[model samples]
Target: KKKCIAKDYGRCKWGGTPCCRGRGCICSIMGTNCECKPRLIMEGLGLA
Candidate 1:
């Protein structure tokens, strides 16, 4: 069976939406709903 997979971020209440740590929104079928990618652009610059 296909389980709800939460990548980058943790799992949500529904357990169906990928979550991150940024400003952009990425919706996944089996993951937690997140804000955006962690460190996002800052990571590249090493500012965050």
Candidate 2:
């Protein structure tokens, strides 16, 4: 029931408390407002 804030991006770790998993935090276009996203999804989209 933790909420992922905007600043949590890149700071939050996967599989850890307060993480972004299943949070629907859509991350797009890394290096530019880059946010947290599923590892595989980012890699597949060439954003990781």
Candidate 3:
């Protein structure tokens, strides 16, 4: 029995997609769709 598979987890179809800061489009990872330039970036970039 397979504990995990592609269907179980959403893979990034467009992994090469560039995520711009407040300019790029949404990002897909593990089947989770999130907007580009999310708030987390601010914290990571030392801006927040």
Worst 10 residues of 1 by lDDT: 15-24
* lDDT string, candidate 3, 17-40, tens digits: 334332333356554663444324
**Model-by-model lDDT, in order?**
0.40, 0.42, 0.36
Best by lDDT: 2
lDDT value for model 1 = 0.40
Off by over 4 Å in 2: 17-48
Clashing pairs in 1: 5-30, 17-31, 17-32, 18-31, 18-32, 19-34, 21-36
What lDDT tens digits, residue by residue, belong to model 1 across residues 1-48? 233332544433433443433223444645544433343533556655
Pairs in clash, predicted candidate 2: none
Residue 3 in candidate 3 has what lDDT?
23
- On TM-score, the candidate that comes out on top is 2
Descending-lDDT candidate ranking: 2, 1, 3
* Tens-digit lDDT track of model 2 for 5-35: 3343444433333343543333344533434
Write down the worst ten-residue block by lDDT for model 3.
3-12
What lDDT is reached at residue 46 by model 2?
A: 61
RMSD of each: 9.6, 7.9, 12.4
